[PDB]
Design a protein around this ligand. Sequence first.
Ligand SMILES: CC(C)(C)CCNC(=O)CCc1cc2cc(-c3ccccc3C#CCC3(NC(=O)c4ccc(F)cc4)CC3)ccc2nc1N
Length: 373
Amino acid sequence: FVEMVDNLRGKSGQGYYVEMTVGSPPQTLNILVDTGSSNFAVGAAPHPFLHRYYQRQLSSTYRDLRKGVYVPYTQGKWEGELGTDLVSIPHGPNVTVRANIAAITESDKFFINGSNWEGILGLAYAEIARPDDSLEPFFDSLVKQTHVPNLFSLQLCGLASVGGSMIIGGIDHSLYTGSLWYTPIRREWYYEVIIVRVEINGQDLKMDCKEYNYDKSIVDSGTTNLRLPKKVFEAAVKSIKAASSTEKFPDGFWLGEQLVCWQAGTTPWNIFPVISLYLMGEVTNQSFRITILPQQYLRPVEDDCYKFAISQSSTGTVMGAVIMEGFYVVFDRARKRIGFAVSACHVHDEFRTAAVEGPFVTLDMEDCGYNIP
Ligand SMILES: CC(C)(C)CCNC(=O)CCc1cc2cc(-c3ccccc3C#CCC3(NC(=O)c4ccc(F)cc4)CC3)ccc2nc1N
């Protein structure tokens, strides 16, 4: 898997993308890696934000499916035409597959002005594909048509440029330290998981664990922050504020609306607590924990200045890039489980160490799951 190491790039706050080729002859595009959606969709007309776009009429292997696709999101959208074509990942497995492709012809609030990606690779499951779950996602096609094993793994390493690795079809031992622990994929739609306990510097938050997963918890490379359900966010912020109270911060800092700065290299990392998320384990009544250092949740932005990268959610927990940057994450689709291990590229603390540790004894973990009617 050495050929796939370092196949991801990005810019701060703009996501991670991988190089792909589409069509015959191959058209090279940079594609955002998104575990929180399930469509393969590419700019296919000259939106001013795009470095380049897919030109479907120049591909001899493009097949028009003669069906439109429309994907609304928070008063924005992408829209276009469905087809299939041959797709490869140059720094990936040595195969080519015929996959569904959405050729985006109109959009609002989707592309980012100044980013270096032109499309999105939705790696989640068919249930959340548009227009419906009959549109087979890319990874499903990859596994069906080739001998690539049904798993991939992500090491995201944290404008300043960014990098990482997407290992397609396996695990690279060089990308983590310590042990890999697995949590079940609760259901195949999002990469849904169940958080069973939360601690701040070892202090139990002491909430009904259902609150941690209200109304779901997902692992999402398509989101920057650790996003927490409102009630949990408020409890977490209260605790982090208490821990760090020897310094004063504007109210807006805790809302992610202003920076806090310190003289070069005098950042008081010690006053910010570690956060442990306990995840449902593979065995009955067994859990494990992942521990994130403050270096994960205080995002550097151009003194050393930082933005608070924990935010409130009204649609459940989102373990975004912030969390993922601390860990090598294994999406073991074949066995309906997600693995975590400390990332070989995570940012270290002077005196404390990140961890993925277990086992713990946690009873009635099924009750931590929220039941969306
Ligand atoms: C409902 C739908 C299928 C659209 C998404 C369901 N998923 C979520 O709600 C989780 C968050 C998310 C929202 C998304 C929204 C869209 C979308 C659809 C129509 C119009 C606009 C958008 C958008 C957006 C934001 C986005 N993400 C980033 O720009 C990004 C920024 C920083 C990062 F670190 C990672 C990603 C480009 C996907 C596309 C993919 C998404 N992927 C995601 N994981």
